[PDB]
């Protein structure tokens, strides 16, 4: 009953803490740094073959193979260098909202409104892609699955939870609860030891894989969050919401640093990614195009307007040589 | 170029051909989104050939996939855009709910939310007004004005049912774009499926006229 009072006080205290360690105004710290300039990117490749809206894509760690899922009930593996289709995996549920590629490259995973993360084995005798597992246990919908290794995957779902599974067994080895809304995005740290999620409660959470408990909470958005990425250093992350704004949060200061918005932008961000140096923040929008931001200056540095519909997914390669954007017009584009 | 690089190209071309052939077979199936406040769910039993529940049946060489999303407890705004492009929306409303509770007003509110939706601008709605049998007895005993104060007509099926049908069809704010195919559900073996097939073929014909430029 009255216990709600203490929490309020505690909340104030927390604010004061992150209010006491705020004396920089990062934008004011970069007054003397040279700007990135102007970034013009060309559609190096166009990957065709999906017959419906594509909803997710993921790069292979080799920076050459990528997987994309679409509503045509297809998970296509593309060789980005030659535009060749390596595999075309037919799915049992065409309502696919996410797709992942194992760091080893042996497996791809996918899921959506079916509430299951199906895991498909690519490197098999028999020369076919068989589904190696179907991880059930979520009561919402899969919005993002991201591999840790060949035998460990971390999912997020519309039931306001995330999970960490074991493949050989198929059981949830950990469950991450604490969101008061659908969890819509996931991002694993470069050390794959702690990940971050962003939910529809307009908040992000920094979790711990081993312990299983939330470590930090991150507010500041005035609408739901759809995209989240980690900065390459693994000490900050970027989130993209429906309020037309991208924000950068630092895990050590427990406070946001930059807000990437413009008055002439009213749509919501669907996907977020960083560059190999973390110096360019790429954000896909509902206005049918993508925007490139100077992550340290907050000023836009370019645009990738080449999609005739909503850009839904977006990802940069590990070597940093290319960018891939997927959209609701059923085409993927490799920029550079 | 290389021997093995050209075998990869041939494999990719075969994959493309199979994708084309599988997309051709999917475009001849008629996807139907099954809605309805508080569930005529369980309307779905008509033909007797985990989030979404896809029910597959066949009628007159036409394949119907009816996707039910009753189990999805998440906010509709985050997964309703997935069904943008379905052939039609089957919206079942129980006539014998005007007296209960208000429930008819909830049905009307849901119909307004769905029909006037950014994603369903051109998606025709098949309005199934079921429970007409119980509606007869209800209006015989309890006047239909319980739910519609403005109602000023005889408490009889012939008039009350029509008044409710017009009160539902008036919620459409885009009558130039979409059409609502109203129907009073009656088991009659293959009577509801027949109406669904008729409305679906009309919608398909409209879409094919639009896709050919002939309209």
């Amino acid at each position, epitope marked *: 009953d009255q216990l709600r009072q203490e929490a309020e006080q505690l909340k104030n205290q927390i604010r004061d803490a992150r209010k006491a360690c705020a004396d920089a105004t990062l934008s004011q710290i970069t007054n003397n740094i040279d700007p990135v300039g102007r970034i013009q990117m060309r559609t190096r490749r166009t990957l065709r073959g999906h017959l419906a809206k594509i909803y997710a894509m993921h790069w292979g760690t080799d920076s*050459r*193979l990528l997987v994309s899922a679409s509503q045509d009930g297809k998970l296509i593996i593309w*060789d980005s260098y*030659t535009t*060749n289709k*390596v*595999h075309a995996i037919p799915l049992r549920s065409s309502w696919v909202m996410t797709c992942a590629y194992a760091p080893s490259g042996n497996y791809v995973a996918c899921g959506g409104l079916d509430n299951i993360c199906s895991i498909y084995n690519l*490197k098999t*005798r*028999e*020369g*076919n892609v068989r589904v190696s597992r179907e991880l059930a246990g979520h009561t919402g919908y899969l919005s993002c699955c991201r591999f840790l290794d060949d035998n460990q995957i971390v999912t997020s779902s519309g039931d306001t939870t995330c999970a960490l599974w074991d493949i050989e067994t198929g059981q949830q080895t950990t469950t991450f609860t604490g969101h008061t809304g659908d969890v819509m995005s996931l991002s694993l740290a470069p050390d794959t030891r702690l990940f971050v999620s962003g939910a529809c409660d307009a908040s992000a959470k920094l979790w711990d894989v081993r312990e299983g408990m939330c470590r930090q909470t991150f507010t500041g958005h005035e609408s739901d969050i759809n995209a989240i990425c980690f900065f390459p250093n693994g000490n900050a992350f970027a989130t993209g919401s429906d309020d037309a704004t991208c924000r950068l949060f630092d895990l050590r200061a427990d406070q946001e640093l930059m807000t990437y918005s413009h008055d002439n932008i009213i749509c919501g961000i669907t996907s977020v990614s960083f560059s190999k140096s973390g110096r360019l923040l790429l954000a896909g929008y509902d206005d049918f195009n993508c925007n490139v931001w100077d992550a340290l200056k907050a000023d836009r540095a370019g645009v990738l307007a080449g999609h005739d519909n909503r850009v839904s997914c977006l990802g940069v390669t590990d070597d940093g040589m290319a960018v891939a954007t997927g959209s609701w017009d059923s085409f993927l584009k490799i920029w550079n | *170029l*290389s*021997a*093995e*690089d050209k*075998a*990869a190209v*041939e*494999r990719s071309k*075969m994959i493309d051909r199979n994708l084309r052939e599988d997309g051709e077979k999917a475009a001849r199936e008629v996807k139907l989104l099954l809605l309805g406040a508080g569930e005529g769910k369980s309307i779905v039993k008509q033909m007797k050939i985990t989030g979404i529940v896809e029910t597959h049946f066949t009628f007159k060489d036409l394949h119907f996939k009816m996707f039910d999303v009753g189990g999805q407890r998440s906010e509709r705004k985050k997964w309703i855009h997935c069904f943008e492009g379905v052939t039609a929306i089957i919206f079942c409303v129980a006539l014998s709910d005007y007296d209960l509770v208000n429930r008819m007003h909830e049905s009307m509110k849901l119909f307004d939310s769905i029909c006037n939706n950014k994603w369903f601008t051109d998606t025709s709605i098949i309005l199934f007004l079921n429970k007409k049998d119980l509606f007869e007895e209800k209006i015989k005993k309890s006047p239909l004005t319980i739910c519609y104060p403005e109602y000023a007509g005889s408490n009889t099926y012939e008039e009350a049912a029509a008044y409710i049908q017009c009160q539902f069809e008036d919620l459409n704010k885009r009558k130039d774009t979409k059409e609502i195919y109203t129907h009073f559900t009656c088991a009659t073996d293959t009577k509801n499926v027949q109406f669904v097939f008729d409305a679906v073929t009309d919608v398909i014909i409209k879409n094919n006229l639009k896709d050919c430029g002939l309209f």
Partner: single-chain antibody
Framework: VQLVESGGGLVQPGGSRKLSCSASGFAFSSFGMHWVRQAPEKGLEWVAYISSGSGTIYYADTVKGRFTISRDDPKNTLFLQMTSLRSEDTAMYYC??????????????WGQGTTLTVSSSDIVMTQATSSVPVTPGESVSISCRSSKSLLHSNGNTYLYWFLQRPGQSPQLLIYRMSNLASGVPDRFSGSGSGTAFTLTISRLEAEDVGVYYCMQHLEYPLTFGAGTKLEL
């Protein structure tokens, strides 16, 4: 997987004969198939190739016109029809798998083969050694040389290494001169460039004694080395 072969036998010169290959345990339709041949006491020679979907067929210059390679995908079968047979056609014929996509491993599985007997610009791969005495635990390096650089402009060096133990069928060890096949230990390795190719074995052991073969997949026809025997 299984690739059984039937039809072999004894025929008179100039006759005709059909060889059948039954596949079981893999997606036959998504696999390119080759017909390799091995004379009684000689090396391997690639005979024919039919792509997945049958949209591409290749023949050796020695069999063009009189050998036809067919493929019955629904029943998972491969056929070789031979007409106007000669004494040079007496050999054991092997059915071989091959899938081609980025990172695949062609020639990963061979059949047991059928024996046929009868009464009485191409790249050249030089495998000079024909015998090498060894003792278990010793490290040996088998050498191969080609008449033309196998390195393609795409960065791939299309060199393949096979091993054929006595009374057995060849078993892929290395594909593209560096990549190690699945089912072979880290003892085997390969390295080189542009017509200079070397295999390497560390901590040799029994069951490694056989004939190591070289092959190029840069372009058709596919050519083999003469085979480097390795005994004790």
């Amino acid at each position: 997987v299984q690739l059984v072969e039937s039809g072999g036998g004894l025929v008179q010169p100039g006759g005709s004969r059909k060889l059948s290959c039954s596949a079981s345990g893999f997606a036959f339709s998504s696999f390119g198939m080759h017909w390799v041949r091995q004379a009684p006491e000689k090396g391997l020679e690639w005979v024919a190739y039919i792509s997945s979907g049958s949209g591409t067929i290749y023949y050796a210059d020695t069999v063009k016109g009189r050998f036809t390679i067919s493929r019955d995908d629904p029943k998972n079968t491969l056929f070789l029809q031979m007409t106007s047979l000669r004494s040079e056609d007496t050999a054991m014929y092997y059915c071989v798998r091959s899938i081609y996509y980025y990172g695949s491993s062609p020639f990963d599985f061979w059949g047991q083969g059928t024996t046929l007997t009868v009464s009485s610009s191409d790249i050249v791969m030089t495998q000079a050694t024909s015998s090498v005495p060894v003792t278990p635990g010793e490290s040996v390096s088998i050498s191969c040389r080609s008449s033309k650089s196998l390195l393609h402009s795409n960065g791939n060096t299309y060199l393949y290494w096979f091993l054929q133990r006595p009374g057995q069928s060849p078993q892929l060890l290395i594909y593209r001169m560096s990549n190690l096949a699945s089912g072979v230990p880290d003892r085997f390795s390969g390295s080189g460039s542009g017509t200079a190719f070397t295999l390497t074995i560390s901590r040799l052991e029994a069951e490694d004694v056989g004939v190591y073969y070289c092959m190029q997949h840069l372009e058709y026809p596919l050519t083999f080395g003469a085979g480097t025997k390795l005994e004790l």
